[PDB]
Design a protein around this ligand. Structure first.
Ligand SMILES: C[C@H]1O[C@H](O[C@H]2[C@H](O)[C@@H](O)[C@@H](O)O[C@@H]2CO)[C@H](O)[C@@H](O)[C@@H]1N[C@H]1C=C(CO)[C@@H](O[C@H]2O[C@H](CO)[C@@H](O[C@H]3O[C@H](CO)[C@@H](O)[C@H](O)[C@H]3O)[C@H](O)[C@H]2O)[C@H](O)[C@H]1O
Ligand SMILES: *[C@@H]1O[C@H](CO)[C@@H](O)[C@H](O)[C@H]1NC(C)=O
Ligand SMILES: [Ca+2]
Ligand SMILES: [Cl-]
Length: 496
């Protein structure tokens, strides 16, 4: 469960939120593989409800109608084609598995689905699976509304509807089998693992019963006995009967406290400063490193739809975001997931964004293709953070320092810190309102290194800042509080 199953030397996965299968296939070959990315988290590949009010929101993909690989991202052929090509180049695919529920109970019956499948929420009829009233928890839920009303009662959190979404009776072997049938179909196609959506709303024991029916990874690409990588989405920030530690037996879990705390520290909210990050990790109340999937922001909380709230950093906060992602990718704690989003028209009113529902860039509902600009950036309103030099170069930085310990930490008692990873890497941050100028111990061998944040090493030279390391491993760093990117990073592979 716990191993990502990525190729030796690749330590991160990227979430290509709402991308089309064909675009991802191309991305695997032209960028992901050459730049050292380990894998890709894709949006739910199964048939979902088509919602026109509001116009095709991103969240309609979390309301399943069937298990047919047919969505706005593409059909089953294009999906299979994407997995094959990505695997052939060393980049794995992780499927977002929405297995806790089906669509909202209020949705109108008919054929308003991404594949024309018929469904009737009112009578609990989903013929394309098939599921009937006997496969839902309507009789098991005890709340008066039928939905989840209090998260302090772990029982209704699991047996009732999450904001109206019809809740699957996962204790029934029939339902467990229909779900395994779906996941095994994907495993046999070549996927390397799954993100279990709304895992908090499922009993750890029901999840385990389903994972027991799963096949080993495809023997054409993976070594015999390979088990699918499993990370469960559980939002646990304390103060609830449900703890993410209850799911350690099924696989890893999403550590939402990670992004929340990093955001407040980097924003310097209510007393926090970067010097406190010295004991970052479990020392902060986080889950063990070998059970954590970490990230700065997610498709959910980057638009206020998840835990984290106001402190969360996103592409909208470019400068601070790059630093946050940089710290995460440099730090040894957990398995890192990089975000890749699209721009939407944020419309704030009373502190809340009324356009948080807006779906991906599209032409009358047809998702726009991801175009690549001459400078490697993306067009058609795709942000492509994974293509930002500062982020892409930190992904590579993680690969280079994989395995090296945390050493040579430094801080000015405020917001200027630095630390290294064994003798393969070093990073410096200046988040104070004044310039940083000092000679630090880097633990790196003597030589001239290229700063991978400001530039790149291109055939014998640096296109940006250059750092000189002496025999005793010391080097001088200068970062004005006015730099576009107030941090510098160098590693063994950026060495001249
Ligand atoms: C969103 C978050 O809510 C909880 O998170 C709780 C948290 O556990 C608790 O501790 C406290 O912080 O409150 C949070 C919000 O209630 C869960 O614990 C967690 O698992 C879940 N996150 C994952 C799963 C779902 C569901 O399929 C997705 O929802 C996403 O899809 C849903 C279905 O299309 C959307 O509902 C939409 O459709 C419903 C249909 O009846 C409508 O009633 C609803 O008004 C509408 O917004 C939802 O807005 C969106 O966020 C989401 O994208 C995905 O990341
Ligand atoms: C690096 O660039 C300089 C010019 O700025 C050039 O003289 C030198 O030969 C280059 N080195 C390599 C290895 O390409
Ligand atoms: Ca449930
Ligand atoms: Cl997530």
């Amino acid at each position: 469960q716990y191993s990502p199953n990525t190729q030796q030397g690749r330590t991160s996965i990227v979430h290509l939120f709402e991308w089309r299968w064909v675009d991802i296939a191309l991305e695997c070959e032209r960028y992901l593989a050459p730049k050292g990315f380990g894998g890709v988290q894709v949006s739910p590949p199964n048939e979902n409800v088509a919602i026109y009010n509001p116009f095709r929101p991103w969240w309609e993909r979390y309301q399943p109608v069937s298990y047919k690989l047919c969505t706005r991202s593409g059909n089953e052929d294009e999906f299979r084609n994407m997995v094959t090509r990505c695997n052939n180049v060393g980049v794995r695919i992780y499927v977002d598995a929405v297995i806790n529920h089906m669509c909202g109970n209020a949705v109108s019956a008919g054929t308003s689905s991404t594949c024309g499948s018929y469904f009737n929420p009112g009578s609990r009829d989903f013929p394309a699976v098939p599921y009937s009233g006997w496969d839902f928890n309507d009789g098991k839920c005890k709340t008066g509304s039928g939905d989840i009303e209090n998260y302090n009662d772990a029982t209704q959190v699991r047996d009732c509807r999450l904001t109206g979404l019809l809740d699957l009776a996962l204790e029934k072997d029939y339902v467990r089998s229909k779900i395994a049938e779906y996941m095994n179909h994907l495993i046999d196609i070549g996927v390397a693992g799954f993100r279990l959506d709304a895992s908090k709303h499922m009993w750890p024991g029901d999840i385990k019963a389903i994972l027991d029916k799963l096949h080993n990874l495809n023997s054409n690409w993976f070594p015999a006995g390979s088990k699918p990588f499993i990370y469960q989405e559980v939002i646990d920030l304390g103060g609830e009967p449900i703890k993410s530690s209850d799911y350690f037996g099924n696989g890893r879990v999403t550590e939402f406290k990670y992004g929340a705390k990093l955001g407040t520290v980097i924003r310097k909210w209510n007393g926090e400063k970067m010097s406190y990050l010295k004991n970052w990790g479990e020392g902060w109340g986080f889950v063990p490193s070998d059970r954590a999937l970490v990230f700065v922001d997610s498709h959910d909380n980057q638009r206020g739809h998840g835990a984290g709230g106001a402190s969360i950093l996103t592409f909208w906060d470019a400068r601070l975001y790059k630093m946050a992602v940089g710290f995460m990718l440099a730090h040894p704690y957990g398995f890192t997931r990089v975000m890749s989003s699209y721009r939407w028209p944020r419309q704030f009113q009373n502190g809340n964004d009324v356009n948080d529902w807006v779906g991906p860039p599209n032409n009358n509902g047809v998702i726009k293709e991801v175009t690549i600009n001459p400078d490697t950036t993306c067009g058609n309103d795709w942000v492509c953070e994974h293509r930002w030099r500062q982020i892409r170069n930190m992904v590579i930085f993680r690969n280079v320092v994989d395995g090296q310990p945390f050493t040579n930490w430094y801080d000015n008692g405020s917001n200027q810190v630095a630390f290294g990873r064994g003798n393969r890497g070093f990073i410096v941050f200046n988040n104070d309102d004044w310039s940083f100028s000092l000679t630090l111990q880097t633990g790196l061998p003597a030589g001239t290194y290229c700063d991978v944040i400001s530039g790149d090493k291109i055939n014998g030279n640096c296109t940006g800042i250059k750092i000189y390391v002496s025999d005793d491993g010391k080097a001088h760093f200068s970062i004005s509080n006015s730099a576009e990117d107030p941090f510098i990073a160098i590693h063994a592979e950026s060495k001249l």
